[PDB]
Amino acid sequence: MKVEEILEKALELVIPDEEEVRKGREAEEELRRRLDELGVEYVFVGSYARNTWLKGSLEIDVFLLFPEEFSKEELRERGLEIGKAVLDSYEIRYAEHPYVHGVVKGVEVDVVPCYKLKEPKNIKSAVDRTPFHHKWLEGRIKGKENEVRLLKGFLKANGIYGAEYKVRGFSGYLCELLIVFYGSFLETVKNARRWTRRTVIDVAKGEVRKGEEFFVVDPVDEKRNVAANLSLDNLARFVHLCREFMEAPSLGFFKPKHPLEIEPERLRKIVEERGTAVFAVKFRKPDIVDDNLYPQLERASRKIFEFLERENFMPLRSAFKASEEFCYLLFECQIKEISRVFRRMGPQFEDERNVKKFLSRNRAFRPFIENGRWWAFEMRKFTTPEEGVRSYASTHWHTLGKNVGESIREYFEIISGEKLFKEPVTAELCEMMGVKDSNSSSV
RNA sequence: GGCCGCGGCAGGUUCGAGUCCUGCCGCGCGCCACC
Ligand SMILES: Nc1ncnc2c1ncn2[C@@H]1O[C@H](COP(=O)(O)CP(=O)(O)OP(=O)(O)O)[C@@H](O)[C@H]1O
Ligand SMILES: [Mg+2]
16 A cells, blocks of 8 residues: 555556457458448547557547638538448447547447548637647657546546546546656656746646636647636646545555445435525426536536525535436535515615605515614515426426527426435435545445 | 636616526637547
């Protein structure tokens, strides 16, 4: 359990076994075979072309390079055409930039179209940097392949690996750049401890400077932030892990933790013990790609959260879950119930024109003077968070994100109490409430 | 699809809204995710 003895045992988890590598090379051999027959200009990129892919996470990426003059429509129609021709079984589901996800001799293959650029300054597609990424990295990353795998494994084990909106973490390319800049996994951990939200890491200049935000400058484009989608919270979650790790190294930092089945009874006691209002918004999952869904669940969850605050229900945290058929928006509030009366502010006693208008309004109770101005008692239209959210989600469905809001329009329901705990949201609830010992890394 | 802006224009809430909530339109090949 010394710092180096643990990195040894951890390499056994992040390094692909030779049986998997062989499967990769065989699929690569057949992939090159089919591509050459089509006479298309291509290149192998990604974690496979640099031998930095994690054990069990084998995926081959193949870029097809087309002329610059090609329309975005022409890039798509030709890219997919080649893709489908090369893959055994394929599947086309993307958010913006078209590509073909499929299989070849049993390995994951992605056939991505892009523009054959010279100098990637003002890229035309979103992925035009990826070939230049590989050209820059192949010569510098050599020998350090396992140092990347330790970092990728360290992050993946703590659920902050991936730049996708489902994660808002560290892209696989960002990890490689960090190894080139620090030299080893251990040197990234040591230094990361003293990162701040202002940290700038310009790899191309071998410099660390201060800035407006966290910013890892892309060697290929000095305007591009490689860590653009890394949330501030996930940045923090990473820094915290590094301080903990150096303070007390362990193999558990590389073991993937998984949720535990919590009894609906134990959960009922925890919420009762807290005396909070725990409820969820349930609706049909819109049939869209994850990268459109999660930004919208974030928005919807926030709009309702903000609503609960200004309505004085004092919300603690928000959360959401996406099962296969349904989406859930969870909320916890300190106020299970509020009074119906509240005090609305009136005008100062001086200017009677406004006061006369104010006191003319028919109210159930008599208004009063306080510290020099008039006040009135008025009634709330709802007295619980559940009743409030029912109203907001009903009327303001449209502001909760395009697809989520339209799905909430057609149907939603507020689930509370024991009926909630029987829903696929236990894991999310335990995280939200800070429930202890609802996780394990047992194999 | 989400996000950040420069503008706006109306509508709602209110004694009172450039200031809180909402809708619509313009313009930055604006940024990010899908590799
Ligand atoms: N969000 C992002 N930011 C910067 N570059 C990205 C990126 N997503 C993809 N890329 C580029 O596309 C290449 C491969 O992308 P992916 O296959 O999706 C992850 P990877 O690099 O293969 O690591 P991984 O297989 O361990 O997940 C990367 O080398 C990178 O150059
Ligand atoms: Mg890959």
